[PDB]
Amino acid sequence: DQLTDDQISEFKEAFSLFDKDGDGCITTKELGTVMRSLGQNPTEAELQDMINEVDADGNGTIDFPEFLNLMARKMKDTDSEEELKEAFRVFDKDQNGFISAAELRHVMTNLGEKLTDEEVDEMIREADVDGDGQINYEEFVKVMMAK
């Protein structure tokens, strides 16, 4: 949950981009500029929502810690997603988008968990929602959560 000093100053850097007048707070106006300057055209209403949902102190603008806390929450969500994707990739030994019984066995072994044939097949079936005999990425996420 603690950020490093370089993550904080990069985040300051990023904040700086949004903070057009450098007053240390980001307005609806400034937010709109940054987006327009990237193709997007949002309503005042939408800008107001984006600010308001970030504006923990309700003063009407986003300051550095408010920005930072958003970024840290996004980062924590990406991280978690990545972790799940990496784990799937480790299991999916032929990189085919499915974990097979054989792939689950081999990998499970190489992680110091040696399973029986029966246990391997049970673990596939538990997770195998659509009954095709192999575990796709969303089955793998589903069953990971179960816990």
Chain residues binding Ca ion by CB under 5 A are 19, 21, 23, 30, 55, 57, 59, 63, 92, 94, 96, 98, 103, 128, 130, 132
Which CB sits closer to Ca ion, 79 or 86? 86
Comparing CB distances to Ca ion, the nearer of 57 and 77 is: 57
Pick 46 or 55: Cβ nearer Ca ion: 55
Residues 31-41 as b/e (b if ≥16 CB within 10 A, e otherwise) read bbeebeeeeee
| Least distance between Ca ion and beta carbon 41 (Å) | 20
- Nearest approach in angstroms of CB 124 to Ca ion is 8
Q: How far is the CB of 135 from Ca ion (least distance, A)?
A: 6
Alpha-helical segments (H) within 60-136: 64-91, 101-110, 117-127
Q: Cβ-closest residue to Ca ion?
A: 96
Count Cβ atoms within 10 A of the Cβ of residue 87 and give its class: 0-12 exposed, 13-18 middle, 19 or more buried: middle
**Is 59 or 110 the residue whose CB approaches Ca ion more closely?**
59
Residue 28 beta carbon to Ca ion: minimum distance, rounded to whole angstroms: 11
The SS3 of residue 63 is strand
Give Rg (Cα) of the chain. 23
Q: How many CA atoms lie within 13 A of 143 on its CB side?
A: 18
